Design a protein around this ligand. Structure first.
Ligand SMILES: CCOCn1c(Cc2ccccc2)c(C(C)C)c(=O)[nH]c1=O
Lengths: 415, 539
């Protein structure tokens, strides 16, 4: 049957325009949609339905098979609330988590007839020689928040038998995904996961994270045989900025070493007073600032800075200077000449951690121009959900500070 | 004789009501024409005599066109329109000549009064009511309502197109090697079939439309190539540009110069060389649109060079999906870029240029990057593919720049082509302090309220200077301090400042700015053999 979904009081459906698509993509969406249309999941619609939601095609790893991805961000936001499952704090303390796309299960359930208009979408045509092909959903759409919700009774129902057979494994559902964490060893783990898929397949359904490894990393300050006017000037500027975080960070003694119009390359002898100050700073930076807790009723935020040479830094927080987590991302093999790829990959990684830790995606602040992002991010997108984002200008010092983060002695040695 | 086509469910905007505007008064003449026209339409099936059961109303008007000087009619739906629901955007992203695939033939069919061929949602009908006045407001005038998509009504175009799509679906399934393009009241049916097989297929399409009610056009009205598509003439073999005529006059108003500057600007996209600098220059301090500004010798001249360029036969090619798509770019002056997309050398599909985007602060590579993205967006829409690029910038200049820029940026598959001027990095701030070189400790401070300030420096070597400024700002002093350091130093310099703006200069390393001052600093930067900018916290 169909449960009466609705929009939040005063809201109207999305009327987001279709961004242009490549011919490869339009051809696949066309294939995919005639099929969905034949199977009864979507129906062509008229011009009386003024709504719209962007669509695109992504690649299902290992296959040539193109997957359809609708961007329901606007509909989701306008969709009434249903007050999902409470986040399992245990999930982060698990040796290895795996992700599975259970979005395919929704086509089975029908969509409230009165809500369908709101799911309208369009397939463009090259050079616009053909009018777009409009359809709306007759079933639960993938990527819509209302789906996992409405399909919850059925999801837990099919899940129990496995959960009891393996009570040491955690299963969490966000959107179309299922993250399964267990403390079992790689093989016993994955074999146990595939055990889950076989289970999941006898109804209709078909990433390897390691959360316990996510180390909180500190800021390590430079140490030197001799310090130059410049070195000190560089150090003083970072420390001064950093005092917005740890107010006990001081640069007065150091600043006195900068009294004088001397050559930038000139070496300055550090006064013991200046040396204690620095040592007291290292001690302060030795640990995360106090009293930072996650407030569930507040937007989570993720800022990123391009560090150069394939390196990237980010910090997830809710309040300025009160970080919940910080980190670095080094490009993945192959991404050598493409920043947008490194960026989308970073956003996906960061977003899954967020899901894994707090069970919600953050709102990003991306160091990219709007048009560069909008034109190419889909090319490298691989997750079923899509986070929110805003485009920003990276303050020179925020980057300078986080580049100071501690890296391994040698590295996580994979013998 | 209307149509067995299913109607579209139409409604009024959020709880509104249909128009109830009063019928404008008309003479016995204008009325008698309208009476004629409405007895006809009443029988074509398009409208229907109604009665006292309808409070709705729209004003009907009588105009005589030129075609027959015959009394015609016009219904003013402005009100009903502002009260009718919103429809999904009718086609507002139209084809571009450069993306058309050439065809052995294209035949344009006229689905002219096809608006009146499509039924109206019987429920909505009451809202389209109007009244034929009586001789100077006598007894009741004649009342009617539409039973088809009304000309000028808001939903007609959308609904007409949709209706046409459903009707056309069968034909398209049955012969995919035939492309039909729906625009307004035309169907541009094209194909690669033998001209005889083509003519035959079109007759079938025509006879198919006949089933659904669309009455077949007259031979007199028929349209033949080349087709006009705003600034272009599509010929079966290729496209050309429509004759763009600059009129010769002895008296130019501001309007004439603005309208002119417009047309010329449009031509800069197609024709190589167009210039409007001296024409625009005539606009300075104008006091009225009707103001007559005399053309200087210089405006006269460029106008003439223009008339000449514009009499060149710029022609073009159509798209062949089996050939490479290539896009070349030229930096035509700082901030201006020209590009031409082709598949086979010298046979362009499209050309164009991007105006000097006068921003607050960038660099050439960033700007080249932006021209490359705009182009890419264009190509995806036009051809659903991105062009291989040929860029006047060395692959080394790109690696050195992009790889270190604070912002994500990219250029798709591209290749270097040496067609000067090559874009490059005007300067690269040093990575570390210059040993040897003099160090300037610069400072500028101004009173934001009195706008009186000072700017100067002191160097490790002893040199110093201070300059007093009036009608300055603190940022200007901070910056002028930097300026003097550059002017007064040798080819290698180390400069220290607490100017937060200089911290931005160090990150982005702009080579063009919105500030003349920052600009001057750039000219000095570029001039040095080595510069090291070191920022330090103020106070
Ligand atoms: C005679 C050349 O006309 C341009 N032409 C056309 C018609 C055409 C005419 C006006 C606007 C758009 C398209 C088509 C289609 C739409 C039939 C084509 O495929 N190729 C082509 O060269």
């Amino acid at each position: 049957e169909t449960v009466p979904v609705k929009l939040k009081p005063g809201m109207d459906g999305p009327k987001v325009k279709q961004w242009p698509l490549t011919e490869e993509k339009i051809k696949a969406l066309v294939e995919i949609c005639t099929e969905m249309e034949k199977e009864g999941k979507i129906s062509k619609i008229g011009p009386e339905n003024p709504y719209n939601t962007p669509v695109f095609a992504i690649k299902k790893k290992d296959s040539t098979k193109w997957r359809k991805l609708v961007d329901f961000r606007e509909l989701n936001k306008r969709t009434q609330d249903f007050w999902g499952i409470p986040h399992p704090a245990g999930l982060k303390k698990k040796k290895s988590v795996t992700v599975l796309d259970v979005g395919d299960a929704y086509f089975s359930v029908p969509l409230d007839e009165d809500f369908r208009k709101y799911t309208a979408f369009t397939i463009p045509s090259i050079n616009n020689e053909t009018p777009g092909i409009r359809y709306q959903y007759n079933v639960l759409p993938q990527g819509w928040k209302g789906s996992p919700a409405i399909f919850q009774s059925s999801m837990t129902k099919i899940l129990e038998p496995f959960r009891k057979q393996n009570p040491d494994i955690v299963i969490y559902q966000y959107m179309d995904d299922l993250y399964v964490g267990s403390d079992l060893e790689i093989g016993q783990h994955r074999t146990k996961i595939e055990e889950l898929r076989q289970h999941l397949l006898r109804w209709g359904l078909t990433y390897e994270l390691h959360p316990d490894k996510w180390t909180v990393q500190p800021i390590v300050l430079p140490e030197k045989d001799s310090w130059t006017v410049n070195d000190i000037q560089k150090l003083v500027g970072k420390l001064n900025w950093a005092s917005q975080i740890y107010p006990g960070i001081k640069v007065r003694q150091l600043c006195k070493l900068l009294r004088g119009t001397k050559a930038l390359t000139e070496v300055i002898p550090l006064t013991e007073e200046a040396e204690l100050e620095l040592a007291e700073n290292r001690e302060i930076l030795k640990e995360p600032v106090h009293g930072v807790y996650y407030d569930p009723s507040k937007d989570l935020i993720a800022e990123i800075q391009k560090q150069g040479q394939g390196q990237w830094t980010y910090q997830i927080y809710q309040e300025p200077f009160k970080n919940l987590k910080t980190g670095k991302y080094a490009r993945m093999r192959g991404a050598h000449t493409n920043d947008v790829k490194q960026l989308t990959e970073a956003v996906q990684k960061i977003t899954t951690e967020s899901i894994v830790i707090w069970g919600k995606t953050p709102k990003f602040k991306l160091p990219i121009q709007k048009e560069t992002w909008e034109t190419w991010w889909t090319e490298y997108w691989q997750a079923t959900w899509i986070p929110e984002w805003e485009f920003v200008n990276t303050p020179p010092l925020v980057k300078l500070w986080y580049q100071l983060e501690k890296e391994p002695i040698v590295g996580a040695e994979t013998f | 004789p209307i149509s067995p086509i299913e109607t579209v469910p139409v409604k009024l905007k959020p709880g509104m009501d249909g128009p109830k505007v009063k019928q404008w008064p008309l003479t016995e003449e204008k009325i008698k024409a309208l009476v004629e026209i409405c007895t006809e339409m009443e029988k074509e099936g398009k409208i229907s005599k109604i009665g006292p059961e309808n409070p709705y109303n729209t004003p009907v008007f009588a105009i005589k066109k030129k075609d027959s000087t015959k009394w015609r009619k016009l219904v003013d739906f402005r009100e009903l329109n502002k009260r009718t629901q919103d429809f999904w955007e009718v086609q507002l992203g139209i084809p571009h000549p450069a993306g058309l695939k050439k065809k052995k033939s294209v035949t344009v069919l006229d689905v002219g009064d096809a608006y009146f061929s499509v039924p109206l949602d019987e429920d909505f009908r009451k809202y389209t009511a109007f009244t034929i006045p009586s001789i100077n407001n006598e007894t009741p005038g004649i009342r009617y309502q539409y039973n088809v998509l009304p000309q000028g009504w808001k939903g007609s175009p959308a609904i007409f197109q949709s209706s046409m799509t459903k009707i056309l679906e069968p034909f398209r399934k049955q012969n995919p090697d035939i492309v039909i393009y729906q625009y307004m009241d035309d169907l541009y049916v094209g194909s690669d079939l033998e001209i005889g097989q083509h003519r035959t297929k079109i007759e079938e399409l025509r006879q198919h439309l006949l089933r659904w009610g669309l009455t077949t056009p007259d031979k007199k009205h028929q349209k033949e190539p080349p087709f006009l598509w705003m600034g272009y003439e599509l010929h079966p073999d290729k496209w050309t540009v429509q004759p763009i005529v600059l009129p010769e006059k002895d008296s130019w108003t501001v309007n004439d110069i603005q309208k002119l500057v417009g047309k010329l600007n449009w031509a800069s996209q197609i024709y190589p060389g167009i210039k409007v600098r001296q024409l625009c220059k005539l606009l300075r301090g104008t006091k009225a649109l009707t103001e007559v500004i005399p053309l200087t010798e210089e405006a006269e001249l460029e106008l003439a060079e223009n008339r000449e360029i514009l009499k060149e036969p710029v022609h073009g090619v159509y798209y062949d999906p089996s050939k490479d798509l290539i896009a070349e770019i030229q930096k035509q002056g700082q901030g201006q870029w020209t590009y031409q997309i082709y598949q086979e050398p010298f046979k362009n599909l499209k050309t164009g240029k991007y105006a000097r985007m006068r921003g607050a602060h960038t660099n050439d590579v960033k700007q080249l990057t932006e021209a490359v993205q705009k182009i890419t967006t264009e190509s995806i829409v036009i051809w659903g593919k991105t062009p291989k690029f040929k860029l006047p910038i060395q692959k080394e200049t790109w690696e050195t720049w992009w790889t270190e820029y604070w912002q994500a940026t990219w250029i798709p598959e591209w290749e270097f082509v040496n067609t000067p001027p090559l874009v490059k990095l005007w300067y690269q701030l040093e990575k570390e302090p210059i040993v040897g070189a003099e160090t300037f400790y610069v400072d500028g401070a101004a009173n934001r309220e009195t706008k009186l300030g000072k700017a100067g420096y002191v160097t490790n070597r002893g040199r110093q200077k201070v300059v007093t400024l009036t009608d300055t700002t603190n940022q200007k002093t901070e910056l002028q301090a930097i300026y003097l350091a550059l002017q007064d130093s040798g080819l290698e310099v180390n400069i220290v400042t607490d100017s937060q703006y200089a911290l931005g200069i160090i990150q982005a390393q702009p080579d063009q700015s919105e500030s003349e001052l920052v600009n001057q600093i750039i000219e000095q930067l570029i001039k040095k053999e080595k510069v090291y900018l070191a920022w330090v916290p103020a106070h």
